[PDB]
Design brief:
Keywords: ATP-binding, Kinase, Nucleotide-binding, Nucleus, Phosphoprotein, Serine/threonine-protein kinase, Transferase, Tyrosine-protein kinase
Shape: globular
Bound molecules: the ligand CCCNc1nn2c(-c3ccc(O)cc3)cnc2s1
Strand content: 15-25%
Order of helices and strands: EEEEHEEHHEEEEEEHHHHEEHHH
Strand order of the largest sheet: 1-2-3-4-6-5
Helix content: 25-40%
Protein name: Dual specificity protein kinase CLK1
Organism: Homo sapiens
Structural class: alpha+beta
Distance between the termini: 53 Å
Largest sheet: 6 strands, antiparallel
EC number: 2.7.12.1
Number of strands: 14
Number of helices: 10
Subcellular location: Nucleus
């Protein structure tokens, strides 16, 4: 159905001519359009599936972005700018400023290579600043992941690197914006039991212990390590295995969280019910290892980044570093005058 209305050359709302598809998600797709009203300026138009779940998210997003874009009209805090919304053949469509590739797609197109540390520093700072602005306004994003962090411009330079015997892309400008506010939840609204894309999901969410702003900090930690390594650190699609990967990289879960959860199926006698000597078990043991062993250098700047990641990946959300504190971490000192 969407297929029929999202084609190159189609005109939306008597104004936006589709150029082609930028990306696709469970919610629908985002297409690049020429805005014939605004002199031909290109914009991004998100076309939402005509399915209750995604319509409701889209309506919620529209409310959240009107609030954020009004509170911060210049995008000082780097939330994407929504321009307008309309309906096309029964689909909600939301128009945004046109950005570049997601950080995820950039990594993927570069053969799953990591970003350079100086870029990670800048991107991390901006992600923290942006999501902290949400947290200051009684909001939790709940779905932070590299697909939802987009470069303002994703242009790169490309040269043969003799060291790794392959061509390699170097990002020119690492500035980012945060997108997708369809799951963003206010402190005083209903909190769904399940949030976040699995790989970025906090342990309090997996264990259904209740969540708030700290779950975003966990997701960010997962994003940073992925920017450093070039790959997803919890790539599994199974909750128990995910928890087993956590234990191998970060150590055992806190006993008090284990005791409090209603997800008894993961546990036996307050320990993860996980056979380490099963095949899945041996894979987890050989693929995963303690966090600091992932470091590619012992240089102090790498140590600083890993200290920050370690603090973001604190199991107990009440002890996890806040984004206000993260912005003052030494890893960011090089950014300051
Ligand atoms: C499909 C993966 C990306 N997901 C989303 N992208 N966006 C966008 C968006 C995408 C590309 C742009 O140039 C500008 C804005 C807005 N809301 C969302 S959810």
């Amino acid at each position: 159905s969407m297929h029929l209305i999202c084609q190159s050359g189609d005109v939306l709302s008597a104004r936006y001519e589709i150029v082609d598809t930028l990306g696709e998600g469970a919610f629908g797709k985002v297409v690049e359009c020429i805005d014939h009203k605004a002199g031909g300026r290109h914009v991004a138009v998100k076309i939402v599936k005509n399915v209750d779940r995604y319509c409701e998210a889209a309506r919620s997003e529209i409310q959240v972005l009107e609030h954020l874009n009004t509170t911060d009209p210049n995008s000082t805090f780097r939330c994407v700018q929504m321009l307008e919304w309309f309906e096309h053949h029964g689909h909600i469509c939301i128009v945004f400023e046109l950005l570049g590739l997601s950080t995820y797609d950039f990594i993927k197109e570069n053969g799953f290579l990591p970003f350079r540390l100086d870029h990670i520093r800048k991107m991390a700072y901006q992600i923290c600043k942006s999501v902290n602005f949400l947290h200051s306004n009684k909001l939790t994003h709940t779905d932070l992941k590299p697909e939802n962090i987009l470069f303002v411009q994703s242009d790169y330079t490309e040269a043969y690197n003799p060291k790794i015997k392959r061509d390699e892309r170097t990002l020119i400008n690492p500035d980012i914006k945060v997108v997708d506010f369809g799951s963003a939840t206010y402190d005083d609204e209903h909190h769904s039991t399940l949030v976040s894309t699995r790989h970025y999901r906090a342990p309090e969410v997996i264990l259904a212990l209740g969540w708030s702003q700290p779950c975003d900090v966990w997701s960010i930690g997962c994003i940073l390590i992925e920017y450093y390594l070039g790959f997803t650190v919890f790539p599994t699609h199974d909750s128990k295995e995910h928890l087993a990967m956590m234990e191998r990289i970060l150590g055992p879960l806190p006993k008090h969280m284990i005791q409090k959860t209603r997800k008894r199926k993961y546990f036996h006698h307050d320990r993860l019910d996980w056979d380490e000597h099963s095949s899945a078990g041996r894979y987890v043991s050989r693929a995963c290892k303690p966090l600091k062993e992932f470091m590619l250098s012992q240089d102090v700047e790498h140590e600083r980044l890993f200290d920050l990641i370690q603090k973001m990946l604190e199991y107990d959300p009440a002890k996890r570093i806040t984004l206000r504190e993260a912005l003052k971490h030494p890893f960011f000192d090089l950014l300051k005058k």
